[PDB]
Amino acid sequence: ADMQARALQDLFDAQGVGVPVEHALRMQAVARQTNTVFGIRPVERIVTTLIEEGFPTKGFSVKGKSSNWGPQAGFICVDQHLSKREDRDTAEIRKLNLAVAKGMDGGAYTQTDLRISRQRLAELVRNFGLVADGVGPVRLLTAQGPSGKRYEFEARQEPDGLYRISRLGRSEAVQVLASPACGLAMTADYDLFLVAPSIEAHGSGGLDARRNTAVRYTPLGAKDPLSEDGFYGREDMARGNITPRTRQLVDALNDCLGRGEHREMFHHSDDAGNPGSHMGDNFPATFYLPRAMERFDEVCVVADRKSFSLLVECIKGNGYHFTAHPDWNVPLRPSFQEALDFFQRKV
Amino acid sequence: ADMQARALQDLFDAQGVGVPVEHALRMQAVARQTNTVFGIRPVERIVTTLIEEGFPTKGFSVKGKSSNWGPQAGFICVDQHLSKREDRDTAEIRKLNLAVAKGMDGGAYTQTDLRISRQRLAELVRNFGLVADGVGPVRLLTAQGPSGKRYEFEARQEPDGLYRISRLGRSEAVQVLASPACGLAMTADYDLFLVAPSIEAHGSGGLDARRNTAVRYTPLGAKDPLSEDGFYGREDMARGNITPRTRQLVDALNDCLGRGEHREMFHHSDDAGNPGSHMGDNFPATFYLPRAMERFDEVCVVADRKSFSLLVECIKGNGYHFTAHPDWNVPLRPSFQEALDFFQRKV
Amino acid sequence: WXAXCPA
Amino acid sequence: WXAXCPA
Amino acid sequence: WXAXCPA
Amino acid sequence: TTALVCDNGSGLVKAGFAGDDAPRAVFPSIVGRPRHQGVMVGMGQKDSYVGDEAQSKRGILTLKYPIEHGIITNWDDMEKIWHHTFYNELRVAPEEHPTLLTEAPLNPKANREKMTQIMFETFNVPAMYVAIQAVLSLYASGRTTGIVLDSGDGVTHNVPIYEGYALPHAIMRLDLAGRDLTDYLMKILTERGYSFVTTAEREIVRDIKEKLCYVALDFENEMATAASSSSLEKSYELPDGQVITIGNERFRCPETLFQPSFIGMESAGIHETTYNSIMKCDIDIRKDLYANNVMSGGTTMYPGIADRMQKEITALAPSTMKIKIIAPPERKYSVWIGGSILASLSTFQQMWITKQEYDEAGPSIVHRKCF
Amino acid sequence: TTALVCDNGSGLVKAGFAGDDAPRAVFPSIVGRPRHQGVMVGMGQKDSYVGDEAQSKRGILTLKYPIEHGIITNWDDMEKIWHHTFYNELRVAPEEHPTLLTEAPLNPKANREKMTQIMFETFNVPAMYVAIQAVLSLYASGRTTGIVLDSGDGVTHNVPIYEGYALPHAIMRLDLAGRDLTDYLMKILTERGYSFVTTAEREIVRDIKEKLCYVALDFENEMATAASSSSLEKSYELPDGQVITIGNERFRCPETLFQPSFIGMESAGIHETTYNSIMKCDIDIRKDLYANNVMSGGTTMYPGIADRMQKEITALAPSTMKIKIIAPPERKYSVWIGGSILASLSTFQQMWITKQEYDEAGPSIVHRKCF
Amino acid sequence: YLMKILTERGYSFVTTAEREIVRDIKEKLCYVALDFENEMATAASSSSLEKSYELPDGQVITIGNERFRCPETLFQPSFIGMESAGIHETTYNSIMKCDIDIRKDLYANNVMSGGTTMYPGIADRMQKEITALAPSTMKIKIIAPPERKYSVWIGGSILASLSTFQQMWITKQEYDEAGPSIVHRKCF
Ligand SMILES: Nc1nc2c(ncn2[C@@H]2O[C@H](COP(=O)(O)OP(=O)(O)OP(=O)(O)O)C[C@H]2O)c(=O)[nH]1
Ligand SMILES: Nc1nc2c(ncn2[C@@H]2O[C@H](COP(=O)(O)OP(=O)(O)OP(=O)(O)O)C[C@H]2O)c(=O)[nH]1
Ligand SMILES: Nc1ncnc2c1ncn2[C@@H]1O[C@H](COP(=O)(O)OP(=O)(O)O)[C@@H](O)[C@H]1O
Ligand SMILES: Nc1ncnc2c1ncn2[C@@H]1O[C@H](COP(=O)(O)OP(=O)(O)O)[C@@H](O)[C@H]1O
Ligand SMILES: [Mg+2]
Ligand SMILES: [Mg+2]
Ligand SMILES: [Mg+2]
Ligand SMILES: [Mg+2]
């Protein structure tokens, strides 16, 4: 009933989740069908509309960072003057520019043109602190570069109904990576957080046999059979450290979305398998529960690492299991901890 | 014959006993069957109806005090502003609140909702000094907090047919502990006073081998093998200082009651084994006698400690025996005292 | 046996 | 056969 | 096994 | 200061405080030690289990009784039993309280001497005494005169006492008691299907007789009735829910007290032994002994052991004597109750062997009322 | 330092770290070697494929299981399996971490002695232990008491344990388990059209039973229903898109656990074997064993294997016993979970065989808790 | 028990009929250790005990250590998990149950009979163990004739031949008149 979406939209909006609820209900319908809990790393309020519009998404190989601000918000710049701004890690400012240039030459195609719908630019100004001077088609923009910098942005309308964009002085074009099959620029993917099948099903067949089980490389001395590129070389180059269950799920979670046939939202391995995961970077997540939770509802927003721990313990007690990434230090299954503390208390 | 219940009801009501006679006859039928005297610590006139209605009961782990007054009468508050009122032991007012909070987190579940039937609230007003202003469903209450305080209580009717309750200012909810399996709030248990099998049967098998025979901890100096938590740790954590006879009896005294299958009235060790017993706190008790007494009738109300002594001497002379709690100083068996005084009078 | 052991 | 082999 | 069964 | 009264019978430790009407601690004199390999690192480390802590936890343990026929046969296990009595069951520092122990009459001097050595040197008890159990049964019966058929787990003994003078030459003792009746019923049940055979199964057959068994008032007629009819066949449910049907051997077990030849024992039964103990007495006291056959200790608890005793003594006694058997309900603890009497009497407070006296006089002092 | 816990069952290596709630590595104990001629100069040079690396890449390989009925039958392939476990799956230098291995009860001493030889001499493991898998299943069940019907790929064995004392004389073992059920379903499917016949086709039939098969609650009525109706005919899709329709043999496969005569095996089923293992126990423990039939290992995962077990034991048990089957969702890994418990306990850190002790005492030291 | 101890070596005898192979393995190979802990030390030290047997299909089974651990179960019933005194303690405890005046003659006449007394060294082991229990002046004599395997039957042939016995038969007429109680004539 529409009230379910109505409430869930406010649960999302208060928590600053950027998943469109019209997708959250389709993903939960897949969680229910596959009897799997899974999670999505944060999707920002910024991106919401781009996902609704039906742009391609960042996919796996695309190295780039992606902006929360300006008209380029929710896109990936490759004219990364953001590089001096987006995180301001000084080594990142030059070196992430050049590594993105390496990625830019390979799998990504490039578009030297933003194509903002005015209604999209209006929503931007209405929400995300763009400053807009408009004579209708004659639009230009102003923004804050989150080191603290201020800019002029020379938009131009086109017969497209979509504005091109550029920054001050560079007033012609901006280059936002664009999927090599489509013509449209890629936005942020739904980066899976974890996949946690019902533990009766966990490890059936090979389904959860992650391609690198111990995820992060460390050398084992003289007897080590795998070099670092021998270790990472058995990641799947398109999906990363995928598992057959994760792969089947990121098929089903694209087939259910009614998504455009080259416009998929999920591309790659769950973050429990990503050797570059950071835990305090995953939140707020959304997790999809096949059944009644037990503070959440069955598309549950996880706000912070302690709320994630409470979710993990509720998942693992309902019988869903996921093999955590080494750096996570999640809580142990309740029926485990209640045995471990039964024996640690000398019996 | 119904006159037996008719007389026994007046024996109860004059003495202010709150056991429903329709239960007293079922418990005496068990006393007769098991050839066991046993006692129940006081059940108040306040509680009577709650036990008739079929609420869960306080069980063992639930630390809380329990009220005799207001609509919360006969329930256990955990919004214990009663704490400044219920006994007015100043150290109890803060510290029993916080210890109840510890208990509240563990074994008890909580309900932030009283659910008084209007007929129950009417009986309350008819008896226990609630002050009630009613436009039918639009009910609210007024009461005395037995330090001397007066209150307004904002009831609200519900489709339940049952009123929620709250106090002045806090006019939404009150939290009365509720058994973790059931949804309903727990009322006062039938706390066994003593169990006194026929002395031919006393100590057969292990039946009366109380888990802590000398009940109250005192240290024995350097050679003591048990620390305090080593001593209390061999109490049964669910039943307390149970004995196999007491356990079998609190099975039979639940099976006979026709009680609901998670709604048991007796949970735990007889007060002869409770290291926190107080004698002047046990009265008026009801004791169930397998046979004709010899002022009582065979479900006998004990009004005061001297009437308890007279009962104990009549029990012990009929041949029932119970190992008293250290703090009791009960009379000695008649056929004992008549030998002891035979020899103390130098023969 | 009838009780105590298997036969 | 029906599966596994040709017949 | 060494005798009795295959392993 | 209250004394302990500590009736360490062959079967149950009964311990408590003087001037209290029954023992606090009543638990079997068994020390079990685990007969199986511990694998759960944590709880299997407890070397041995004592008393009721080991009658449960039972099937894992070989259960050894430290006392047999009233004689302590294992002393490390009796120090375990007493350590648990004082510090786990009674929770009393024995350094603090006098200790009235008890033992059977006519048994080795080494038992009083070792009990007293252990009380004075392991438990440091301040003063102690070692009463004869059938004297205690008279203090418990509130009378100075009577022949006490105190029958326990280990021993049945008569001590005739008259006006407070025991007649030691008339003291009978049988090493025939509830344990020989347990081991007999444990055989008679194998005439039916049931093979109780280990220790711990001994405790099932013990509970089978402490429940089902009764004394036939006329044994040959109960045998004829049980062969005729199923009307005696009470049934019992073993610890695993098997139903055992008993019937005929329900009364043949305690008949062993009246016909010791059943347990292969060359002896007079307890009726003949009581009567023969009265005939050992001076003829002038026999009227009062016949009128006061106090019974005490647990194996006198069988239904109809009085009345059978009365019928049999009345068949022996000379037809004008008021044969009266005194079998109070509490007889099960009468030895302890009488020890609580005794240890309460002001005239008794001189009788304690104080540790100073034991140190000066040496272990001969303990035999003060020897029998 | 975390220990490894390394449940090399007959079917799957389950390996991980102690004090973690499930294995990281779970991959089959198979070593495939290519049965066909390599022609592409470059990748066909890999001599052999281990675990999940070889269950895919499957139809090119003859798949050999190193362990059969819990006994390691090939050691060069078990060193491959363990080399891949430590250095490719867990990525741990075993030189660094103690290793809790496991094995079935009642199996050759040569298996512990070769496992320990290999751990100390190929992998240089600093210290190690070799736990019985059905003891681990109790640590995983958080209880000291119960009869563990641990049923695996290779072996089904009951170990009754009570209060932490295993009763080794009551340990049953069947060489009847998920692999004999695989090879049976692989035959029963040829009553329908389907000829699964090679290894690798063994892995299709394995997945067919790990998916479709369930235990009949009343086998003769499920047979009557499946002969009456198509309502049981679930279908499965083979790796090449052929649809296999199964139906009747959907439940006849795991019935082989309760009627081993199907796989031609002279044995009691697992219900009779569990009950017979309880009857081997002391009567005083059987109530608590009946109330704690822990189930563990993968072939206890069939839908309705509990409940069928409960119905059958309740038909065997004596009508007053609370027959309770404990079949948690994680039972699939309970042996490993219990090994993670065990290797985490502080009381356990003395139990490791250190390599120094193995060098001084020789290989007899490994049989510390033998069974 | 031997059917289990053999699985410490490779051999899994497990069915009935395989029970009959292990039966024949002990009726052939097994013997009683005269000093069990020294035979264990010797068999751990040396292959000198490892007799081998050939299964019904020509597999050769090598046994050795469990060759004597099987019948040790008679003297240490705890091996078969059984709470009991061994047969030496059980024989001695059965003599102590007797009247002291007969024990000299019982100690001098420990007849052995029936098949499991056929193990090599079950006498002598019995004698050593009873002599360790018996009070050092008793002539502990174990009578283990070669025919002991059938001694129960041979003694039944004696008994049924005695003229004094021909009255002891329960005749069918007596069984019909007295009913089944008559059969317990010498009950034990
Ligand atoms: N699953 C997986 N992902 C990987 C791996 N290596 C690199 N990645 C990539 O790292 C990326 C994690 O950081 P970001 O690129 O900032 O994620 P995002 O969702 O775009 O966040 P933001 O908009 O703030 O830039 C996502 C993933 O495509 C891998 O081995 N496995
Ligand atoms: N049998 C037993 N009870 C214990 C033990 N420790 C705590 N208790 C608890 O103490 C409680 C005694 O005081 P209350 O909680 O006031 O009893 P009540 O019947 O609820 O009385 P009121 O309504 O006036 O509060 C009952 C019992 O659950 C123990 O070791 N043994
Ligand atoms: N009610 C009873 N009926 C029959 N036998 C009993 C009964 N109570 C105890 N017994 C037996 O008597 C012995 C217990 O004797 P008791 O005298 O109480 O202790 P102790 O023998 O140590 O003095 C045990 O053999 C027990 O089997
Ligand atoms: N869910 C399942 N249902 C039925 N059979 C299963 C299931 N999971 C595993 N099995 C079977 O049990 C075996 C796996 O057993 P498991 O105990 O997990 O490993 P191991 O046997 O090595 O200890 C395989 O035969 C597999 O076919
Ligand atoms: Mg991504
Ligand atoms: Mg209570
Ligand atoms: Mg006694
Ligand atoms: Mg296994």
Q: Could you tell me the distance, in angstroms and rounded to a whole number, from the CA of residue G332 to the centre of ligand 4?
A: 7
CA B308 – CA B317 distance, rounded (Å):
14
Solved using:
cryo-EM
Tell me which chain C residue has its CA closest to the CA of residue G318.
Answer: C3
Is residue F341 a contact partner of residue F330, using CB atoms and an 8 Å limit?
no
Residue G182, phi-psi category: left (phi > 0), alpha (psi -120 to 50), beta (remainder) = alpha
Is residue G51 a contact partner of residue G61, using CB atoms and an 8 Å limit?
no
Tell me which chain G residue has its CA closest to the CA of residue C4.
Answer: G283
* Cα separations in angstroms, G5 against A211, F54, F214, G19, G90: 21, 35, 59, 9, 11
Is residue F6 a contact partner of residue F85, using CB atoms and an 8 Å limit?
yes
Question: Is C4 within 8 Å of G279 when comparing Cβ atoms?
Answer: no
The C-alpha angle B60, B66, B68, rounded to 5 degrees, equals 145
Q: Could you tell me the distance, in angstroms and rounded to a whole number, from the CA of residue F215 to the centre of ligand 3?
A: 14
The beta-strand segments (E) located in chain B are 36-40, 109-111, 116-117, 131-135, 138-145, 149-153, 162-163, 176-178, 192-197, 285-288, 299-302
Q: Which of G90, F359, B302, G157 is nearest to A214 (CA)?
A: G90
* Cα separations in angstroms, G343 against B3, B19, G297: 69, 54, 19
Is residue G100 a contact partner of residue G339, using CB atoms and an 8 Å limit?
yes
Query: End-to-end alpha-carbon separation of chain H, Å?
Result: 30
Is residue B64 a contact partner of residue B316, using CB atoms and an 8 Å limit?
no
Q: Which ligand is nearest to the CA of G179?
A: 4
* Cα separations in angstroms, G220 against G233, G255, G300: 17, 11, 21
CA A209 – CA G56 distance, rounded (Å):
11
Q: Which atom of ligand 4 is nearest to the CA of G206?
A: 27
Q: What are phi and psi of G119, to 5 degrees?
A: -65, -40
The residue type of A277 is: S
- Residue partners of A20: CB distance under 8 A and separation at least 6: A48, A51, A52
Nearest CB neighbour to F198, from listed H83, H97, H181: H83
Q: Which residues pair with F64 in a beta bridge?
A: F31
Among protein residues, the one whose CA lies closest to atom 13 of ligand 3: F153
Q: Could you tell me the distance, in angstroms and rounded to a whole number, from the CA of residue G152 to the centre of ligand 4?
A: 6
Q: Which of G282, G142, B232, B201 is nearest to F32 (CA)?
A: G282
Q: Which residue has the tokens 């009470």?
A: F234
Is residue B34 a contact partner of residue B64, using CB atoms and an 8 Å limit?
no
Q: Which residues pair with A38 in a beta bridge?
A: A195, A288
Tell whether A14 is within 8 A of chain G (Cβ).
no
Interface of H with F (CB under 8 A): 78, 81, 83-84, 97, 181
The angle, 0 to 180 degrees and rounded to 10, between the axes of the packed helices G178-188 and G249-258 is 140
Q: Which of F10, F52, F14 is nearest to F140 (CA)?
A: F14
Nearest CB neighbour to B221, from listed F20, F93, F143: F93
Nearest CB neighbour to G91, from listed A202, A214, A321: A214
- Residue partners of F124: CB distance under 8 A and separation at least 6: F94, F95, F355
CA B212 – CA B193 distance, rounded (Å):
17
Q: Which residues pair with A237 in a beta bridge?
A: none
Element (DSSP H or E) covering residue A299: strand A299-302
Alpha helices in F75-147 (DSSP H): 75-84, 109-121, 133-141
Q: Which residues pair with A287 in a beta bridge?
A: A39, A300
Q: Which of B55, B59, B98 is nearest to B73 (CA)?
A: B55
Q: Would the CB of G136 count as within 6 Å of ligand 4?
A: no
Whether the bond into A180 is cis, omega within 30 of 0? no
CA G303 – CA G300 distance, rounded (Å):
8
Instruction: Give me the DSSP letters along G190-209.
Output: GGTTB---STTHHHHHHHHH
Q: Could you tell me the distance, in angstroms and rounded to a whole number, from the CA of residue A195 to the centre of ligand 5?
A: 15
The residue type of B288 is: Y
Tell whether A248 is within 8 A of chain G (Cβ).
no
Pairing of strands G243-245, G235-237: antiparallel
* Resolution as reported, in Å: 3.2
CA F256 – CA F180 distance, rounded (Å):
9
Nearest CB neighbour to D5, from listed G192, G195, G244: G195
Neighbour-count burial for B106-145, b at 16+ CB within 10 Å, e otherwise: ebbbebebbbbebebbebbbeebebebeeeeeebbbbbbb
A268 annotated to a ligand binding site: yes
CA F131 – CA F353 distance, rounded (Å):
12
Q: Which residues pair with F362 in a beta bridge?
A: none
Q: Which residue has the tokens 């068949």?
A: F315
Is residue B28 a contact partner of residue B155, using CB atoms and an 8 Å limit?
no
Is residue G295 a contact partner of residue G133, using CB atoms and an 8 Å limit?
no
CA G341 – CA G354 distance, rounded (Å):
20
CA A185 – CA A160 distance, rounded (Å):
15
CA atoms within 13 A on the CB side of A238: 4
Q: Would the CB of B247 count as within 6 Å of ligand 2?
A: no
Interface test with B, best of F87, F88, F214 (most B CBs within 10 A): F88
Q: Would the CB of A275 count as within 6 Å of ligand 1?
A: yes
Q: How many CB atoms lie within 10 A of CB G102?
A: 25
Q: Which of G169, G175, G367, G106 is nearest to H6 (CA)?
A: G106
Q: Which residue has the tokens 């888990």?
A: B211
Tokens of G213: 């098969």
Interface of F with C (CB under 8 A): 190, 192-197, 201, 238, 242, 244
Q: Which residues pair with B134 in a beta bridge?
A: B139
Q: How many CB atoms lie within 10 A of CB G40?
A: 7
* Cα separations in angstroms, F136 against F150, F334, H140: 10, 7, 47
Query: Order of strands across the sheet with G25-28?
Result: G25-28, G12-17, G4-8, G99-103, G127-132, G353-354
User: Which one-letter DSSP state was computed for residue G274?
Assistant: H
Residue G296: strand, helix, or coil: strand
Q: What are phi and psi of A213, to 5 degrees?
A: -70, -60
Whether the bond into B284 is cis, omega within 30 of 0? yes
Residue B234: strand, helix, or coil: coil
Tokens of G84: 């891949």
G201-207 long-range contacts (CB < 8 A, ≥24 apart) are G201/D4, G202/G63, G203/G55, G203/G58, G203/G63, G204/G238, G204/G239, G206/G178, G206/G182, G207/A205, G207/G236
Q: Which of F315, F178, F152 is nearest to F254 (CA)?
A: F178
B156-159 long-range contacts (CB < 8 A, ≥24 apart) are B157/B118, B158/B115
Instruction: Give me the DSSP letters along F18-35.
Output: TT-SS-SEEEE--EEEE-
Q: What are phi and psi of G296, to 5 degrees?
A: -155, 165
Q: How far is CA G24 from the centre of its chain?
A: 17
Q: Which residue has the tokens 């529409």?
A: A2
Q: Would the CB of G106 count as within 6 Å of ligand 4?
A: no
Interface E-H, measured as beta-carbon pairs within 8 A, has a size of 24
Instruction: Give me the DSSP letters along F298-355.
Output: GGGGSTTHHHHHHHHHHHHS-SSS---EE--GGGGGHHHHHHHHHHH-GGGTTTSEEH
Tokens of A190: 């739904």
Residue F61, phi-psi category: left (phi > 0), alpha (psi -120 to 50), beta (remainder) = beta
Q: Is the dihedral of CA A124, A126, A127, A131 positive or negative?
A: positive
Q: Rg for chain D (alpha carbons), in Å?
A: 4
* Cα separations in angstroms, G283 against B303, F200, G215, G371: 48, 9, 31, 21
Give ion ligand 6 contacts, CB < 5 A: B 189, 191
Touch between D and A (at least 3 CB pairs under 8 Å)? no
Is residue B18 a contact partner of residue B44, using CB atoms and an 8 Å limit?
yes
Q: Is the dihedral of CA B239, B241, B244, B245 positive or negative?
A: negative
Element (DSSP H or E) covering residue F272: helix F270-279
Touch between G and F (at least 3 CB pairs under 8 Å)? yes
CA F160 – CA F148 distance, rounded (Å):
6
CA G321 – CA G286 distance, rounded (Å):
9
Q: Could you tell me the distance, in angstroms and rounded to a whole number, from the CA of residue G302 to the centre of ligand 5?
A: 38
Touch between H and E (at least 3 CB pairs under 8 Å)? yes
Tell me which chain F residue has its CA closest to the CA of residue C1.
Answer: F193
CA B232 – CA B249 distance, rounded (Å):
23
Residue B210: strand, helix, or coil: coil
Q: How many CB atoms lie within 10 A of CB B49?
A: 19
Q: Could you tell me the distance, in angstroms and rounded to a whole number, from the CA of residue B34 to the centre of ligand 3?
A: 21
Rounded to a whole number, what is the largest CA-CA distance in chain G? 70
Q: Which of F142, F136, F156, F182 is nearest to F30 (CA)?
A: F182
Q: Rg for chain H (alpha carbons), in Å?
A: 21
Q: Which of F364, F190, F14, H13 is nearest to B202 (CA)?
A: F14
Interface D-G, measured as beta-carbon pairs within 8 A, has a size of 24
Q: Which residues pair with F79 in a beta bridge?
A: none
Interface test with F, best of B220, B232, B242, B309 (most F CBs within 10 A): B220
- Residue partners of F318: CB distance under 8 A and separation at least 6: none
Residue A129, phi-psi category: left (phi > 0), alpha (psi -120 to 50), beta (remainder) = left
Is residue G12 a contact partner of residue G153, using CB atoms and an 8 Å limit?
yes
CA G243 – CA G237 distance, rounded (Å):
4
The residue type of G336 is: W
Element (DSSP H or E) covering residue A2: helix A2-15
Tell me which chain D residue has its CA closest to the CA of residue G196.
Answer: D4
Q: Would the CB of G10 count as within 6 Å of ligand 4?
A: yes
Report chain B residues whose CB lies below 8 A from the CB of F93: 220-221, 223-224
Torsion, CA G56, CA G58, CA G61, CA G67, rounded to 10: 70
The residue type of B312 is: V
Q: To the nearest whole angstrom, how far is the Cα of F266 from the nearest Cα of chain H?
A: 10
Q: Could you tell me the distance, in angstroms and rounded to a whole number, from the CA of residue A63 to the centre of ligand 5?
A: 9
Question: Is G330 within 8 Å of A344 when comparing Cβ atoms?
Answer: no
Tokens of A141: 């923009």
Q: Would the CB of A42 count as within 6 Å of ligand 1?
A: no
Is residue B190 a contact partner of residue B17, using CB atoms and an 8 Å limit?
no
Burial label, A117 (beta-carbon count in 10 A; 0-12, 13-18, 19+): middle
Alpha helices in B113-221 (DSSP H): 118-128
Q: Which atom of ligand 2 is nearest to the CA of B188?
A: 20
Residue G34, phi-psi category: left (phi > 0), alpha (psi -120 to 50), beta (remainder) = beta
Pocket test for ligand 1, best of A38, A48, A60, A242 (most atoms within 8 A of CB): A60
A236 annotated to a ligand binding site: no
Interface of A with G in 312-331 (CB under 8 A): 316, 319, 321, 323
Nearest CB neighbour to F199, from listed H81, H83, H181: H83
Q: Could you tell me the distance, in angstroms and rounded to a whole number, from the CA of residue F206 to the centre of ligand 3?
A: 9
Q: Which atom of ligand 2 is nearest to the CA of B192?
A: 1
Q: Which residue has the tokens 């640590």?
A: G139
Burial label, G181 (beta-carbon count in 10 A; 0-12, 13-18, 19+): buried
Q: Which of G136, G144, G147 is nearest to G286 (CA)?
A: G147
Pairing of strands A149-153, A162-163: unpaired
Q: How many CB atoms lie within 10 A of CB B32?
A: 14
Interface of F with H (CB under 8 A): 35-36, 62, 198-200, 227, 264
Is residue B34 a contact partner of residue B252, using CB atoms and an 8 Å limit?
yes
Q: Provide the total of helices (H) and of strands (E) in chain F, helices listed first.
A: 13, 19
CA B119 – CA G123 distance, rounded (Å):
78
Q: Which of F68, F58, F12 is nearest to F33 (CA)?
A: F58
Q: Which of G143, G183, G137, G130 is nearest to G156 (CA)?
A: G137
